[PDB]
C-alpha cells in the first residue's frame, strides 16, 4: 500500500503525472496516512510539481477538516516566499483549492495570507498577485476583508519596471473590481490618470479592465469568439433518483488615440495592449476615431506577432457598428483572400465569424476557407454563420459535403466524421462506407467517433429500399459493441442505441447480440445492457422474459448468499435499473424483492445503503397502494437515518425516498401523530442544510404530508 504510493509519487514528480495523481485520488477515496504524509513532505522538500499535485489531488478526497489545513498552511507559505517557475503556479492554485474547502480555519488562513501578500506588494510582487487572485477566486467573501490596502499596494507594485508582473496585477485588480461591482471607481480612475501622464502596457491594462467592467457588451462578443427539447414532453412514469467611467470616457478615448497614433512603431507589449484597448473603446465609444482605429489595426495586421490581435479587434469593431465597417470589410477580405490560398490560420477564421455578425461576400470566401484546412475553429465558424445567417445554405452544405467526401475517400479523419454527425446535412452512401473505418483501423480514437456518428447518421428511420441498409449497418454496431477489446469502445456503442431504436432492436437476430452483453466483466456495460433489454422486454416478451427470470433470481441470489459489501452494492444497483425500466413485469414480484431489501436495512458501508434506499424509491411507484403493510415498519428505518443521525452521511436519498413512498401509498396526515418529531426535524433541515437539492426536497415532503394547523402541533408536542 505504501510502497506503491511512494513509487507512484516519485514517478509523477519526475501525462504520467496527471494519471498518477488521478489514480492516487481514486485509491485514497476508495480506502497508511503516515506514509502518505511522509512521502508528501519528502516530495515537497525535494519534485515540486509532483508534491503540489499530490497534495491537490488528496485535497477534497480524503476529507481533511482542520488537521490537513494546518499541515498544508505551513507548506503553502514555504513556496510563497520564493517565486518559483510556472510549476509553482499549481501550488498557488492548490493552496486556493484547499482554502475553498470550507474549513473553520480557512477564514483565518485567508486573512493571514492577505496580510503576508500585502507586505510583498519580481519574486515577491508577482507571487503576491497570483496568490491574491487565487484567494479571491476561491474565497470572494474573504477577499473583501481588506480591499482598500490592496488597491494602494497594487497601485505601487504595478509601477515597478517589469512586464509580466503587470499582467498578474491587472488580473488581480480586475478580479477585485468584479467582486466590488457584483456586490473605489474614483480612486481607480485617478490612479490610472496619474500614471498615464515601461509605462505603456501597464497603463493600457488598467484602462482596459475599467472599460470592460463599465461596459460588458464587448465582453460577450469576446467570450463567444473565444469559445468558437420541448415544453410538451410527457414525464417518464418511473422517475429514478437524480457613472464615473462614463463621465471620463471621451478624455480616456482621446488619450488612448493619441498614444496609439504616437507609439506606432516605438512600442510589442504596447502594440498588443493597444489592439485590445481599441475593441473596448470602439464598443463603448462609437468617424475620425473609427477610421484611425481601422488604420492602426490594418498597419498591425501585416505586422509580425500582431495579426491575431488585429483580426480580433477588427471583428469587434465591425460588430459594434455595421456602417463603420460596411466599406472597410473589403480590406480584411482582400488581405485574407490570398492568405487562405497560401496555406496562424485559427485567428483568420475567427475574424470572419466575428465580422459576419453582406450576404454576398461569403459566397466566394467559402472556397478559400475550404483550402485553408480542417480545424475545429473553421467548422465552428462555418456552422455558426450558417445558423445565424442562412444566406446560402445549399452552398455551405455543398462545400462541406464535397470536402467530407474527399477526406473520407482515403487523426485528421476523426474531425471530419465529427462534423458530419455534428449538425444536420442533406446520405445512404456515407453510412455504408462509414461501416469500414472501425473494422480496419486499429486506432482506438477513430473507432470511438465512428460508432457515435453512425447512430446519429441513421435519421431516416415503409419501403423495402432503406429498411435493408439500416438493418445492415445496425448489425455491425452490435458486433463491435460486444467484440471489441477495450471497454471504452464498447461503452459508447451501447449508449448510442437509445430508446429511439426500440422498434428495430426487437428482431430475433438483434436480441441475441444484446443477450451476450448481459454477462460482461465490466459493470458499466452490464448496468447499461440490463436497462436496454428491460425496455425491449415489453416489445418481444417471447425472447426476453425467459432469460430475465434466470437473471432476476441471480440478482437476488447475490444479495443474501454472498457476504461481500461490494457485491451486494453491485447487485442492488442493477435491481433498481430493472424495476425503474420495466415496471409491469416486476409488479407481481413485490413480495420477494421488498422482503430481501428490508432485511438488508436491519443488518447488525455507505455504498450499500445509498443504493437500496434509491431502489425502494422506484419500488414505491410501480406498486401503487400495494406497499401498504410495509410503510409502518419502513418509517422507523428511514427516520433513524434522519433524526439522531450519528454520522453525517448522505441524507438526500433518505429524504427523497421518504417523500416518494408517501405520495403513492397515501400515508399523509397519520405519521404526524405516531412520530411527534418528524415535523420539527424537517424544519431544522432548512437552516442547517445548505445544498440546494436537499432544500428543494424537504419542502416537497412538507407539502405532501400536509399543512396541519398549529393547534394540532401543540397537541402532538
Amino acid at each position: 500500500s505504501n510502497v506503491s504510493v511512494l513509487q507512484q509519487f516519485a514517478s509523477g514528480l519526475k501525462r504520467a503525472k496527471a494519471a498518477k495523481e488521478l489514480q492516487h485520488y481514486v485509491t485514497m477515496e476508495l480506502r497508511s496516512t503516515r506514509f502518505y504524509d511522509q512521502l508528501n513532505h519528502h516530495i515537497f522538500e525535494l519534485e515540486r510539481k509532483g508534491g503540489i499535485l499530490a497534495i491537490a489531488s488528496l485535497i477534497g478526497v480524503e476529507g481533511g477538516n482542520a488537521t490537513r489545513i494546518g499541515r498544508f498552511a505551513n507548506y503553502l507559505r514555504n513556496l510563497l516566499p520564493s517565486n518559483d517557475p510556472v510549476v509553482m503556479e499549481m501550488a498557488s492554485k492548490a493552496i486556493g483549492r484547499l482554502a475553498m474547502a470550507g474549513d473553520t480555519f480557512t477564514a483565518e488562513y485567508v486573512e493571514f495570507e492577505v496580510k503576508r501578500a500585502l507586505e510583498w506588494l519580481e519574486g515577491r510582487r508577482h507571487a503576491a498577485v497570483l496568490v491574491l487572485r487565487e484567494l479571491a477566486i476561491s474565497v470572494p467573501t474573504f477577499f473583501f476583508q481588506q480591499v482598500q490596502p490592496f488597491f494602494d499596494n497594487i497601485f505601487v507594485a504595478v509601477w515597478d519596471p517589469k512586464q509580466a508582473i503587470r499582467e498578474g496585477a491587472v488580473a488581480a485588480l480586475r478580479a477585485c473590481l468584479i467582486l466590488t461591482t457584483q456586490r473605489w471607481y474614483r480612486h481607480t480612475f485617478e490612479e490610472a490618470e496619474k500614471g498615464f501622464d515601461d509605462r505603456i502596457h501597464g497603463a493600457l491594462l488598467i484602462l482596459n479592465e475599467l472599460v470592460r467592467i463599465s461596459s460588458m457588451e464587448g465582453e460577450r462578443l469576446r467570450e463567444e469568439m473565444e469559445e468558437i427539447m420541448g415544453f410538451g414532453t410527457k414525464p417518464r412514469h418511473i422517475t429514478p433518483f437524480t457613472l464615473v467611467e462614463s463621465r471620463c470616457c471621451r478624455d480616456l478615448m482621446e488619450e488612448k488615440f493619441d498614444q496609439v497614433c504616437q507609439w506606432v512603431l516605438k512600442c510589442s507589449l504596447i502594440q498588443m495592449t493597444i489592439l485590445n484597448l481599441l475593441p473596448r473603446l470602439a464598443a463603448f465609444r462609437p468617424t475620425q476615431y473609427l477610421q484611425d482605429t481601422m488604420n492602426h489595426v490594418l498597419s498591425c495586421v501585416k505586422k509580425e506577432k500582431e495579426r491575431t490581435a488585429a483580426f480580433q479587434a477588427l471583428g469587434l469593431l465591425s460588430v459594434a457598428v455595421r456602417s463603420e465597417f460596411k466599406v472597410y470589410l473589403p480590406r480584411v477580405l482582400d488581405i485574407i483572400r490570398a492568405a487562405l490560398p497560401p496555406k496562424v490560420d485559427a485567428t483568420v477564421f475567427t475574424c470572419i465569424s466575428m465580422l459576419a455578425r453582406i450576404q454576398q461576400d461569403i459566397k466566394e470566401l467559402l472556397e478559400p476557407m475550404l483550402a485553408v484546412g480542417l480545424s475545429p475553429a473553421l467548422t465552428a465558424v462555418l456552422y455558426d454563420l450558417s445558423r445565424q445567417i442562412p444566406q446560402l445554405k445549399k452552398d455551405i452544405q455543398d462545400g462541406l459535403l464535397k470536402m467530407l467526401s474527399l477526406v473520407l475517400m482515403h487523426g485528421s479523419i476523426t474531425l471530419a466524421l465529427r462534423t458530419l454527425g455534428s449538425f444536420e446535412f442533406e446520405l445512404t452512401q456515407f453510412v455504408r462506407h462509414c461501416a469500414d473505418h472501425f473494422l480496419n483501423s486499429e486506432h482506438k480514437e477513430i473507432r470511438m467517433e465512428a460508432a457515435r456518428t453512425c447512430s446519429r447518421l441513421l435519421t431516416p428511420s415503409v419501403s423495402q429500399t432503406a429498411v435493408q441498409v439500416v438493418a445492415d449497418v445496425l448489425s455491425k454496431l452490435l458486433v463491435v459493441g460486444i467484440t471489441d477489446p477495450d471497454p471504452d469502445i464498447r461503452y459508447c456503442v451501447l449508449a448510442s442505441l437509445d430508446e429511439r431504436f426500440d422498434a428495430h432492436l426487437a428482431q430475433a437476430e438483434n436480441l441475441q447480440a444484446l443477450f451476450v452483453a448481459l454477462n460482461d466483466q465490466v459493470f458499466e456495460i452490464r448496468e447499461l445492457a440490463i436497462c436496454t433489454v428491460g425496455r425491449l422486454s415489453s416489445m418481444n416478451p417471447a425472447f426476453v422474459m425467459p432469460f430475465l427470470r434466470k437473471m432476476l433470481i441471480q440478482i437476488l441470489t447475490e444479495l443474501e448468499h454472498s457476504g461481500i459489501g461490494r457485491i451486494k452494492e453491485q447487485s442492488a444497483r442493477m435491481l433498481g435499473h430493472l424495476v425503474s425500466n420495466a415496471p409491469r413485469l416486476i409488479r407481481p414480484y413485490m413480495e420477494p424483492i421488498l422482503k430481501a431489501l428490508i432485511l438488508k436495512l436491519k443488518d447488525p458501508n455507505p455504498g450499500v445503503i445509498n443504493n437500496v434506499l434509491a431502489t425502494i424509491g422506484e419500488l414505491a411507484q410501480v406498486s401503487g397502494l400495494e406497499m401498504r403493510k410495509w410503510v409502518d415498519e419502513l418509517f422507523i428505518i428511514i427516520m433513524d437515518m434522519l433524526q439522531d443521525s450519528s454520522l453525517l452521511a448522505k441524507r438526500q436519498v433518505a429524504l427523497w425516498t421518504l417523500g416518494q413512498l408517501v405520495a403513492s401509498t397515501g400515508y399523509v396526515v397519520e405519521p404526524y401523530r405516531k412520530y411527534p418529531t418528524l415535523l420539527e426535524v424537517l424544519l431544522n433541515f432548512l437552516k442547517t442544510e445548505q445544498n440546494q437539492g436537499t432544500r428543494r426536497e424537504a419542502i416537497r415532503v412538507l407539502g405532501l404530508l400536509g399543512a396541519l394547523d398549529p393547534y394540532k402541533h401543540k397537541v402532538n408536542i
Binding site: 422498434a503 426487437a506 428482431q507 430475433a508 416489445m539 418481444n540 417471447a542 425472447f543
Partner: peptide, 29 residues
C-alpha cells in the same frame, strides 16, 4: 384476417391475433 376486420371485433369485446405465420416470434409494434 384483415386489420380492418379485427377492429370491428375489438369493439364487441372479441380479440384476435394480429400476426402472420411467416414469423413464429411475433413482435407487437
Amino acid at each position: 384476417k384483415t386489420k380492418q376486420g379485427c377492429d370491428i371485433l375489438k369493439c364487441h369485446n372479441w380479440d384476435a391475433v394480429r400476426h402472420s405465420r411467416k414469423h413464429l416470434w411475433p413482435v407487437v409494434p
